[PDB]
Design a binder for these strands. Structure first.
Ligand SMILES: [Mg+2]
Ligand SMILES: [Mg+2]
Ligand SMILES: [Mg+2]
Ligand SMILES: [Mg+2]
Ligand SMILES: [Mg+2]
Ligand SMILES: [Mg+2]
Ligand SMILES: [Mg+2]
Ligand SMILES: [Mg+2]
Ligand SMILES: [Mg+2]
Ligand SMILES: [Mg+2]
Ligand SMILES: [Mg+2]
Ligand SMILES: [Mg+2]
Ligand SMILES: [Mg+2]
Ligand SMILES: [Mg+2]
Ligand SMILES: [Mg+2]
Ligand SMILES: [Mg+2]
Ligand SMILES: [Mg+2]
Ligand SMILES: [Mg+2]
Ligand SMILES: [Mg+2]
Lengths: 145, 67, 54, 55, 143, 206, 56, 70, 141, 56, 63
RNA sequence: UAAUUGCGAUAACGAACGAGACCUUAACCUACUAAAUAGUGGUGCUAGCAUUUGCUGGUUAUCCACUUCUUAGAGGGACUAUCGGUUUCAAGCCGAUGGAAGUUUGAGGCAAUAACAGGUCUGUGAUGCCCUUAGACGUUCUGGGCCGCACGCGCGCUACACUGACGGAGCCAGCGAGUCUAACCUUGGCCGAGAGGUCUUGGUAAUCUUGUGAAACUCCGUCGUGCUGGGGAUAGAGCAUUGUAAUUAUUGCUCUUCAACGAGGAAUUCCUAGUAAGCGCAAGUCAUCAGCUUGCGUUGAUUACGUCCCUGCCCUUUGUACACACC
């Protein structure tokens, strides 16, 4: 298309949401490295942040990046549909959350631990390192842990 | 494997023995000839018979052939 | 359910530490074969009996 | 359908069929002939359905 | 020399109608565009984001023009395709129905299509006008 | 060139070579004559064809195979390894693409350079599995001129297909690199390597 | 009523078989050799072919 | 490692300086000289066709082809 | 009435119907001209009946072809056959024999079955394998 | 057994057949079962002609 | 490298226990009137040209 | 020869079943009989663009006329014909030419006597004997289980990508099947991101769903060789759908999670031309559920035209103390 230049102000390896992110790649795919961030959520948000998807995560004035941040923990305020999110309706407060980065591992625990402390057949199934989804365990699951 | 069975060569045999006059070497004449002389219940069979009794003729003119 | 989770001697890392029995890979057993034609019924219908019928 | 009654053997299928042929004819007739042509010219195993209306 | 859209190659066409359908600016993008996937069998949302509704309108149109009538149902069956069930084999899927209905609902408002008898959407008389028009210009771009 | 027109038009450059010389989509079937002895009647070069797609009969009888257009046998042997079974369009276009490339580098005729890499790569004599009176030995035998083109086609395709595997390069490039390196055999090509060693194994056991 | 032509004629031969088997048994002691079904308007005719009609 | 995802202007200086003498230039031959990852290899071949230089005898996705200008 | 013949191409399950009448030199397929055809690699193959005989022959006549049945590549070898047969059907009925047999002579010299339908047919599948010949894999024991 | 099948065939032969074949499988009076082939005249065992000319 | 062009003048038979080899008596084109029997690999008919990488030598029996 | 198919040799001659014939389906009918449930042409009615007539569509039948497409009645065609090679110049085999078609024209259907302690009392209101028969092994109701998971083995499904994934876009089939004592095939329109809901519609069907606008695929781009945007296991949360009932999650969608797998050791299966392989569809099963089957078309090769080496089996010769026949 059109060759660009900028300066040394292109920066590789930027850290955000307590995770290091690769520059020098299309910014849409640099944000998926962050936990809870997939290819759809990185698409919709990068759009909703009014960021050039042709541009790499390298330059990305920090004002832009801080915009990109804000929407990821503020989905319903920037009008991302509410079907677009992983944690909906919760189990307690009843609200809808997109849990991201180190917080997805965090909240993942609680879900299991709930089921575990509840003495649920699926928590039983989880304590035993087994298949929770009801599939046949006979043949599959061999080389295992 | 194109080989005529016995029901084909026995027909062709007994046909030329009594019908050698008429029975020109040309197939299509002999084939049509067969319907008015010999009774055969198949389209193909009649053509298979014909084409062989044809062969008997075409060689016979170069001298006899056994049987 | 209360007993199920807490109980040790239960799990996957549990069973994965033990040894797979030899009868696992025992193959066929063939059952009765090559004895097929020799009649265990041990009757042998009789010359006069088989001519009276057939 | 599988040939064998039970389970065993190499798996032999078989395909039965039944052939249905359907003809229909158009006529213009007075009252006597439709009733005359239909009441007779019956035949076993053949299904004869007749009626007019353009519809 | 006289023209119909059947005189113009498929892709060169639908681009140009989508080029002008942009400069027209009167479409009615439903507002959920750019957030949507177009299919229950597709991986990603369209790579064009803003746009591609100009492309699907320019797709839908030229299809409706070329034949008698086409319903939103048929449009589902058309654009859709093999979906990846992943570990499972690939089965056909219909595309997103609303995306295909809100091209028709908003191509009706723009006068390039009309509710037909026999059900469906028949090409509009002014559609025939506006289509064959950009058709000729497209060959008359290449002069 | 006498540009006649009629209601639905046929383009000029289209119109031109068609009524005229019979060449490829555009390439010269004249010149391009077999650059080795033998190999004749096993290297087709006629009748000329615009593209490498054909209905084809070449199966039902033995040597009808050798009558097929050689470039068509190039794309034919090209579509393979699983997912590429069928799908001749991908191959026919990749060949026009490749011919585009071989012509672009060191000029001449890609279609002749194809034959130049085929006439180079045929093994002259090779070996067979012989039971013997003991540990099996190798009997050097000369190899058919037909087979000489046979194992040459796959030779180049394999190397162009195997090298194009999992590298940024595109098939037509790996097709041309193979064809070019073998046009005058550089031993850097997968095909010319294998040719010599199977002719070496014949001089070996002799 | 209201039958598909397809589904009807299948249910026809089934009606043949069923009736054929009811006659195979009950009339076995008459030497029943098999039936035929002639259908017309009005009735449905059913023709036993036995070897002893007098007992039928 | 090799990167080649950005301009690094002396790379752009290579382009105008280093693409005579090329009997073949494409997407691959761009990455084949130590530079220009594919996503800009097309960008470079579009901008190289802004004027002169490369002469497009080929066509499309996958295969691109060019030579010098005369 | 205008002098009008009709022919058909057949390739695999495809049927390509041809209407060849007298006209201004239009050649269009279905509703669209022969400059599309849209394999675009093989569209040169439906050019073939023309460029074998020379382009002038098509002026005084009109050509339209409409195809149904088959796949993408299936129909092309039908329509190129639907043309060449109409161009020898026109030279059959209206103009004389000697040119019809001048076309038939240079049509089938290079050939590729413009005149003759391709008799190769899909074979039935047999139980025991997914394909016709292909049999399901057996493990012994 | 031997008298029933031999009489039956003679009747089917006297009735003007071109041949007939009486099979009896099973066990009669002796615990191990056997079969028997009782037949006469001429038959074709294969082809379409079986459908027309032989009744089983 | 001396180039030996040998035309196949007759097809003899198929040697080998698996029968892939075809026995052929050939004729070298430079200075005709003399003949040798060689053994081939792939498909062969009469009047095919063959390249011997050595001139005078003969095989006979393969197993 | 595919064949105990023949030629031939000849104490045999001349026949029978099986093979072949036959049958089904697939190839060819500008010839025959026809069709608003199939269409083509012409003619009206009509829209757009060119305005020289023209190009491309819409058109409850508005009528004219037709059968090339199509459909299924009736027939014709191939006989390896013509010719040239070869051979006991015998049956045949071989190439070219002709031809819709020349591998038994391709594919099936049917299939002699004889062998098995092959399988099937869990298909049967086929059945002998034995067991049980009222605290039932009968039948039903409730619920779980056949799916249970340290592992071993088999058919497969999806993958390791650049002949590729992804996004648009072009957009091509056949074999099918479908609603009356109903609740099926369902267009169209409306609401929904999706799954799906709802208001209508035709169809007992060559008439409506359907042209099943299938999928590989072609095409312009986004990535760029990095376990990568290849791969989608695992799992979490949310929405729907079948059904009395879905937890051990029937099924589907949405987002997040992103494992193994970098071409797979010894071995080992299927297959010779529209075949193999790639691709999807329809039917069986079905309330819901296909990674399975039975068919079908779509894309369409590489390599044989041979052989007896492994393997298997058939035939004679031979030997025998077996004949309940090497169990
Ligand atoms: Mg992520
Ligand atoms: Mg599609
Ligand atoms: Mg698409
Ligand atoms: Mg028995
Ligand atoms: Mg028996
Ligand atoms: Mg038979
Ligand atoms: Mg017989
Ligand atoms: Mg057969
Ligand atoms: Mg129960
Ligand atoms: Mg089970
Ligand atoms: Mg259809
Ligand atoms: Mg339909
Ligand atoms: Mg993915
Ligand atoms: Mg094996
Ligand atoms: Mg259903
Ligand atoms: Mg159903
Ligand atoms: Mg289930
Ligand atoms: Mg004894
Ligand atoms: Mg012993």
């Amino acid at each position: 298309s059109l060759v660009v230049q900028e300066q040394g102000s292109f920066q590789h390896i930027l850290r955000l949401l307590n995770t290091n992110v690769d520059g020098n790649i299309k910014i849409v795919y640099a944000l998926t490295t962050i936990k809870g961030v997939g290819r759809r959520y990185s698409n919709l948000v990068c759009k909703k942040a009014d960021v050039d998807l042709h541009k790499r995560a390298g330059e990305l004035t920090q004002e832009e990046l801080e915009r990109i941040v804000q929407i990821m923990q503020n989905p319903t305020h920037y009008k991302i549909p509410a079907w677009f999110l992983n944690r909906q309706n919760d189990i307690t407060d009843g609200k809808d959350y997109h849990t991201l980065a180190n917080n997805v591992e965090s909240k993942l625990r609680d879900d299991l631990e709930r089921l575990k402390k509840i003495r649920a057949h699926r928590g039983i199934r989880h304590f035993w390192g087994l298949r929770v989804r009801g599939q046949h365990t006979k043949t599959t699951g061999r080389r295992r842990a | 494997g194109r080989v005529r069975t016995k029901t084909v060569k026995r027909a062709s045999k007994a046909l030329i023995e009594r019908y050698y006059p008429k029975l020109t070497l040309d197939f299509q004449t002999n084939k049509r000839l067969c319907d008015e002389i010999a009774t055969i219940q198949s389209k193909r069979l009649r053509n298979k018979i014909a084409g062989y009794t044809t062969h008997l003729m075409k060689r016979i003119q170069k001298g006899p052939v056994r049987g | 359910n209360e007993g199920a989770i807490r109980d040790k001697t239960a799990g996957r890392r549990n069973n994965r530490s033990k040894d797979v029995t030899d009868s696992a890979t025992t193959k066929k057993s063939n059952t009765r074969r090559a004895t097929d034609r020799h009649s265990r019924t041990g009757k042998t219908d009789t010359k006069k009996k088989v001519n009276q019928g057939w | 359908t599988r040939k064998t009654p039970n389970g065993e053997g190499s798996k032999t299928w078989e395909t039965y069929e039944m052939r249905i042929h359907k003809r229909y004819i158009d006529l213009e007739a007075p009252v006597q002939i439709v009733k005359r042509i239909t009441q007779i010219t019956i035949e076993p195993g053949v299904d004869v359905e007749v009626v007019v209306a353009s519809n | 020399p006289g023209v119909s859209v059947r005189d113009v190659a498929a892709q060169d066409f639908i681009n140009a109608y989508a080029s002008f359908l942009q400069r027209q600016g009167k479409l009615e993008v439903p507002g959920y565009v750019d957030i949507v996937k177009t299919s229950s069998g597709n991986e990603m949302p369209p790579q064009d984001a803003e746009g591609w509704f100009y492309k699907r309108a320019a797709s839908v149109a030229r299809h409706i023009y070329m034949r008698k009538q086409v319903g939103v149902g048929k449009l589902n069956k058309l654009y859709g395709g093999a979906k990846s069930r992943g570990v499972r084999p690939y089965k056909h899927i219909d595309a997103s129905g609303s995306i295909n209905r809100k091209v028709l609902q908003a191509l009706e408002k723009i006068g390039i299509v009309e509710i037909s008898p026999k059900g469906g959407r028949r090409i509009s008389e002014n559609g025939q006008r506006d289509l064959d028009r950009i058709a000729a210009q497209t060959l008359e771009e290449d002069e | 060139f006498t540009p006649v027109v009629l209601a639905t038009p046929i383009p000029e450059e289209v119109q031109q070579a068609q009524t005229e010389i019979k060449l490829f989509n555009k390439w010269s079937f004249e010149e391009v004559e077999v650059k080795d002895a033998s190999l004749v009647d096993y290297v087709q070069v006629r009748q000329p064809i615009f593209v490498a797609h054909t209905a084809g009969r070449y199966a039902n009888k033995r040597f009808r195979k050798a009558q097929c257009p050689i470039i068509e046998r190039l794309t034919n042997s090209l579509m393979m390894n699983g997912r590429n079974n069928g799908k001749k369009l991908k191959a026919v276009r990749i060949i026009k693409h490749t011919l585009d490339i071989i012509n672009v580098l060191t000029d001449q005729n890609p279609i002749q350079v194809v034959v130049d890499a085929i006439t180079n790569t045929g093994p002259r004599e090779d070996t067979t599995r012989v039971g013997g009176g003991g540990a099996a030995r190798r009997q050097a035998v000369d190899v058919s001129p037909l087979r000489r083109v046979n194992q040459a086609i796959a030779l180049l395709t394999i190397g162009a297909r195997e090298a194009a595997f999992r590298n940024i390069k595109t098939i037509a490039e790996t097709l041309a690199e193979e064809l070019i390196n073998a046009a005058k055999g550089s031993s850097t090509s997968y095909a010319i390597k294998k040719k010599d060693e199977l002719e070496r194994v014949a001089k070996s056991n002799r | 009523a209201l039958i598909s032509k397809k589904r009807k004629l299948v249910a026809d031969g089934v009606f043949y078989a069923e009736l054929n088997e009811f006659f195979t048994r009950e009339l076995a002691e008459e030497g029943y050799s098999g039936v035929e079904v002639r259908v017309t308007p009005t009735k449905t005719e059913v023709i036993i072919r036995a070897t002893r009609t007098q007992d039928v | 490692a090799q990167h080649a995802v950005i301009l690094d202007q002396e790379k752009y200086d290579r382009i105008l300086k280093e693409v005579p003498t090329y009997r073949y230039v494409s997407v691959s031959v761009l990455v084949d000289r130590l530079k220009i990852g594919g996503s800009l290899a097309r960008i470079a071949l579009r901008h190289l066709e802004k004027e002169g230089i490369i002469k497009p005898i080929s066509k499309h996705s996958k295969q691109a082809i060019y030579t010098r200008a005369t | 009435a205008v002098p009008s013949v009709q022919t058909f191409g057949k390739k695999k399950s495809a049927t390509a119907v041809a209407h060849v009448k007298a006209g201004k030199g239009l050649i269009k397929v279905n509703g669209s001209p022969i400059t599309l055809v849209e394999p675009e690699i093989l569209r040169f193959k439906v050019y073939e009946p023309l460029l074998l005989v020379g382009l002038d022959k098509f002026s005084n006549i009109d050509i339209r072809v409409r195809v149904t049945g088959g796949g993408h590549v299936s129909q092309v070898y039908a329509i190129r056959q639907a043309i060449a047969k109409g161009l020898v059907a026109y030279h059959q009925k209206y103009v004389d024999e000697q040119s019809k047999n001048e076309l038939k002579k240079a049509f089938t010299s290079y050939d590729r079955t413009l005149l003759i339908a391709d008799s190769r047919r899909p074979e039935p599948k047999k139980f025991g394998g997914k394909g016709a010949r292909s049999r399901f894999q057996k493990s012994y024991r | 057994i031997r008298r029933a099948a031999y009489g039956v065939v003679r009747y089917v032969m006297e009735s003007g057949a071109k041949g007939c074949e009486v099979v009896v499988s099973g066990k009669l009076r002796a615990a191990r079962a056997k079969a028997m082939k009782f037949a006469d005249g001429f038959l074709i065992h294969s082809g379409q002609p079986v459908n027309d000319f032989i009744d089983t | 490298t001396p180039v030996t062009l040998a035309k196949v003048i007759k097809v003899l038979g198929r040697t080998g226990s698996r029968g892939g080899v075809t026995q052929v008596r050939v004729e070298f084109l430079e200075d005709t009137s003399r003949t040798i029997v060689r053994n081939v690999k792939g498909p062969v008919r009469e009047n095919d040209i063959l390249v011997l990488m050595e001139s005078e030598r003969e095989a006979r029996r393969l197993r």
